Amino acid sequence: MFDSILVICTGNICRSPIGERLLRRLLPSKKINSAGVGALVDHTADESAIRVAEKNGLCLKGHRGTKFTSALARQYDLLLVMEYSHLEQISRIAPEARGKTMLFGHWLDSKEIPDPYRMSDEAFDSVYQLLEQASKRWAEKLG
Ligand code: NI
């Protein structure tokens, strides 16, 4: 059913690139990409995002900041967004995509993945763990 996944945050330089790569790791046969409702277009992944990722053996290399659009959403069967506030931005930008959008941390007790941008390394450690735990559970479901 859900063969394509679009992972979405704000900048597309911290959370979604990490969520994207975690999910690809777990579900190698699916088309998994990422974008941001406030994306820094053509920007590489955030330095702190790359730090926490490599520290955990995860590779963010080759990433490119990408803007989320209704047109892009059309190519994916499932959208996973980081924040509650993102849900309303999807409704506003892509009304026809809202019906296939869910939180990235839907399966976690607390569902929102907080914004680490500009924060210290330990906030990034924390966000990484949340993304990782959320990813394992999403993979359990789509398997
Ligand atoms: Ni620029």
Q: Where are the domains of the chain?
A: 1-143
Q: Which method was used?
A: X-ray
Q: Tell me, in angstroms, the distance from the centre of ligand 1 to residue 45's CA.
A: 12
Q: Tell me, in angstroms, the distance from the centre of ligand 1 to residue 107's CA.
A: 34
The CA distance from 14 to 48, in Å, is 8
Beta bridge pairs of residue 33 = 6
Of the candidates 7, 11, 10, the one whose C-alpha atom is nearest the C-alpha of residue 86 is: 10
Q: Tell me, in angstroms, the distance from the centre of ligand 1 to residue 1's CA.
A: 37
Of the candidates 98, 97, 53, 89, the one whose C-alpha atom is nearest the C-alpha of residue 73 is: 97
CATH homologous superfamily of 1-143 equals: Response regulator (3.40.50.2300)
Q: What is the CA radius of gyration of the chain?
A: 14
- The helix (H) or strand (E) run that includes residue 5 is strand 4-9
Q: Which positions are annotated as active-site residues?
A: 9, 15, 115
> Which residues have C-beta within 8 Å of that of residue 92, sequence separation ≥ 6?
none
The CA distance from 10 to 43, in Å, is 13
Which runs of consecutive H residues, i.e. helices, occur in 3-143? 15-26, 47-55, 70-73, 84-93, 121-141
The CA distance from 13 to 34, in Å, is 10
The residue type of 36 is G
- The helix/strand/coil state of 102 is strand
